[PDB]
Subunit: 326 residues, 4 copies
């Protein structure tokens, strides 16, 4: 289960925040992909192709598939799990894309939430991955994106049929249930106020109401030196302890890492639970030229970065997305 | 306001943490006090003196009085808030140890909760509480002491009469009401189970229940690299958001920093709500010799640190405790 | 705000329960209407007409409009307030019916939930009443009906467009919000269980979850001597104290009366808060012949009935429904 | 289990009600006892005797011992449950008044809480608790007494030591834990406000909070016709559903009947969960003369009544209290 929230500050101040929780280690890493690069939405299926128009920084999943990142044009994307997401019924002859690269496609071809919604509602392809290949627990997610202007759009495939809700009023997103209900739930908690009562359980829906109430009670300021820690605080509030385990639940999904993107100033921020220090990357201080080279920022070996870990950027081989089932 | 809890792990692993919530800036700092330092419990009233037994690292608040820290013997003490507090009735005439140095006196002259339990129950000195009318809240608090053995003790002068609670079970504590109630109220939610319901509200009791439930659920492991993060994680959870304001409730005490101690290894980790990195100080690499010098680690000007901030210490003169209500801002 | 719940007992055991709460006195009464009677869906508007096919007993509203009742064929109807119910936008040339008689129409022309749904989805008319005529607080409701078989159908007009949900799994109904959300809310409370935690507030949505969990934990028995009090208990649980008043809320809507219908055995049950005793009426012990006469069962003057208040039935003039705005 | 609360209205209006929840049938009944009836606090142990001062209407449980009632002086007493109860420590040798007649002895020999407060604090007699191993829960309860003046008192033998709480504020009481905690826990929800949140759960504390909040919100009126229904309304609210069963929690104590008293007018209203009408008995129309005769109003066979059930009383012999653990069913 994961959550993501977006802050709408004065003077185009847009800062997004995404959570990462998983049962075991995620082995995620940060890769930087300049523009002018082509990719295939799938390797063993009929698929579409494109050409990376913008550079961006994203967080990987075991070095297999992107699930969060921010592009040059202050636009951030995030994939959160949704236990009731189906992408297509039989009879789909469209170019089958794979859920592993769904994220990467959008960031490489979009810079404004408006434009992204347009091409998506064409359903020009079906994006899928086989079920429980590695005996995994679940394998179904939904994505959220936001531009440096403050507009956001939640996307979910309802048993094959896409389901999208666009607008700036929608700035938080958890796992389950369906958003229309996920939001309807909050209607009840808002009347009971947040101060006089606030549910502290860890269920997917519970994490939603908390973020909603706090992300508004936060100070309405356009400055960037303060909003960043403010966004992370609620991320820490919504974040859950690591290594939890009760008699009923033998193993649990713990808070592994979180991400925040200063979409107004184009600065991505990333933190790991088992790390003491906080680092960041300034996209404006990054050469996304067509021929700049792929520099990786590894985190598996437990490296400890901090500050502007741009000097620590090392040229590395872009992780190969996985559409097979092994 | 704040919230404190203690973790009890195998292999003598006992990690304690603390939270700090304030409506404005605390302007806290950090100072070092080698052993063998005489001190007076007050500058103008009849109070005892002493010479620091064990060197102690303490975190200051406004550079007037220590609010939390440690000493040379895995003895971590913290001072939280409590409105319904009364230290003495009209007529008390004992030595009135100012509240500003009460904690420091403890860390200085104690290394085990059992000892402090004794010297405390002697009821030798009163507690001096200054009163101020211009934007100042009267001093009404309580304290908690934990030993590297894992034994904890709660102290609170309830309506002029002090009540102490010792034991290893007693590991969590928050603002109000009195622990006699807070502990029992929590037992209610215990029935409900944390997985199913938990008062996520920022209120005192709400935080107490959440900390109590999670502190057990966290991993019980003897390794420090794992238990420490598992601790601060609940610290951030119990910690309320930063700078919350509502039209009805305009100002609210917001979190300003968190403190964690590895009493099993004598380490102190510190982070601020406005400081991204997490620095620490290895007490073992310290020298508390009587003539080692008072060392300060300023933070008023917003200095930034990370890792082990041993090299970045600068000797300075001891701060000045506050025993009498300030005349004005 | 009002609530209604339906019990599905073994061997076609169907018993419905409806709540009544209002700010001040309701001045309601119980009228019996045999079959073979004609009515007009509105007096000053183009309207449809029919001929009462079955007899039934209903509870009136100030002696102006029916809001609850049970027919011969063990089918019960109930109108509950819904603050977000609109019945038609401009351009409605259909026979305008009035919200006051909407209830009476269904009971007089239906005996099975299936048949009722059919004719309703024709939208052959618009049923409306002018807004705040007597300075009233609100004036928008939704209806729930159930046959002696156990099938129920909730109905709500979404800004003119009807909204219906049919099935036996839907046996409880409160005021707000919309049902699709009103039910989605319960999804959260069911996971938290009812025993280990149950919200006791009085808001419309809160009253829903309580009834849902209890109406299932109740014993699954086909006997009728016990299920009746069981249904009323939750009605008492969902029922709220009378004359409540805090500093914030100066006057409140108190629990005035409740109703339960033994749809399997065709027996209607009614209780008033300010009355000590409980009475009932056995439809099977009632002559709904075309020419039987209208016998009223008054309750305004605070009469105190009990037991089988059929002997207390007195021939009276059927209350005239109100479509005007005075 | 059960739950009790007291309403305080102007013009000396004080209406008290009670709830009864049991896993099976209580087989309760009703009996009348005119004044001037000698009684012994036990049949086989050393116990005091007495002669009933004030006639008292009591509701029996299994026709063995009174669980609630009243006397000739607007003095309504009730007996609720409490697991963590201890009446005396090993070695007590005082008069051991059986728990079955403790209540009756009170109503018989008292007319004001102040008096009972005195005679009770004398600590003259112990409490006899029988122990049974076959489907029987050991007797562990507490009591509450209210006077027509509106003053209430809570009594509970906590770990062999009795603790009393008197006053007009103390009007609500439930199962567990001890009122010292139950009262304070409720103060928590008080913060949350009843309109915004209320633990609708059937648990002991949940019911206590709901009753406390609503009992104030109900109409404060001097007329009986209005206050009485406003009372029983909260009684039904606090009352848990009937015959609840879950696969995990199979059997649960369900509500069986509710009792209300108009202490200002000396009336007793009674209803059963399986009885639709609400009958009552006007104590004023009663004769408790010493030789008036013990009168019973049976309910085992499920008789049905309504209105004022004065005419439908049938004289019978007094029931038999239980002082010793029954040999078997
Ligand atoms: C959140 C919680 O905000 C995003 C979570 C995403 C990154 C993960 C849930 C995801 C998609 C990553 C990869 C794994 C997914 C499934 O659990 C199936 C596999 C499980 C295996 O343990 C690792 C690789 C898979 C593909 C997983 C939910
Ligand atoms: C429930 C709560 O289950 C059914 C409630 C129905 C019977 C009432 C809400 C209703 C329709 C009855 C009549 C009155 C309605 C409005 O409040 C507008 C008027 C108010 C006035 O005080 C009495 C007559 C009106 C038509 C009312 C909601």
């Amino acid at each position: 289960m994961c959550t993501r929230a977006v802050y709408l500050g004065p003077d185009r101040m847009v800062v997004t925040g995404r959570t990462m929780d998983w049962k075991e280690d995620i082995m995620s890493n940060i890769y930087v992909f300049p523009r002018g690069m082509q990719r295939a939405g799938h390797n063993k299926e009929k698929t579409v192709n494109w050409t990376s128009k913008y550079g961006s920084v994203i967080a990987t999943g075991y070095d297999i598939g992107t699930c969060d990142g921010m592009n040059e044009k202050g636009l951030v994307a995030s994939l959160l799990f949704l236990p009731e997401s189906v992408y297509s019924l039989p009879g789909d002859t469209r170019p089958a894309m794979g859920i592993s690269i769904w994220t990467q496609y959008v960031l490489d071809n979009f810079a404004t939430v408006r434009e992204a919604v347009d091409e998506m509602k064409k359903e020009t392809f079906r994006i899928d991955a086989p079920r429980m290949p590695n005996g995994g627990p679940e394998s179904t997610l939904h994505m959220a994106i936001t531009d440096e202007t403050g507009n956001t759009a939640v996307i979910e495939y309802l048993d094959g049929k896409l389901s999208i809700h666009e607008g700036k009023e929608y700035q938080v997103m958890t796992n389950s249930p369906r958003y229309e209900l996920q939001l309807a739930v909050n209607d009840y908690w808002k009347e009971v106020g947040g101060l006089q009562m606030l549910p502290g359980t860890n269920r997917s829906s519970d994490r939603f109401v908390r973020a909603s109430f706090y992300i508004h009670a936060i100070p309405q300021t356009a400055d960037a030196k303060i909003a960043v820690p403010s966004v992370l605080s609620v991320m820490r509030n919504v974040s859950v302890p690591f290594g939890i385990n009760t008699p009923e639940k033998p193993h649990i999904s713990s808070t592994r890492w979180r991400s925040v993107s200063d979409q107004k100033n184009k600065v991505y921020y990333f933190e790991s639970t088992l790390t003491p220090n906080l680092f960041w990357l300034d996209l404006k201080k990054i050469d996304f030229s067509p021929k700049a080279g792929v520099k990786k920022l590894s985190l598996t070996k437990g490296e400890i970065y901090a500050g502007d870990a741009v000097k620590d950027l090392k040229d590395s081989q872009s992780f190969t997305f996985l559409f097979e089932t092994p």
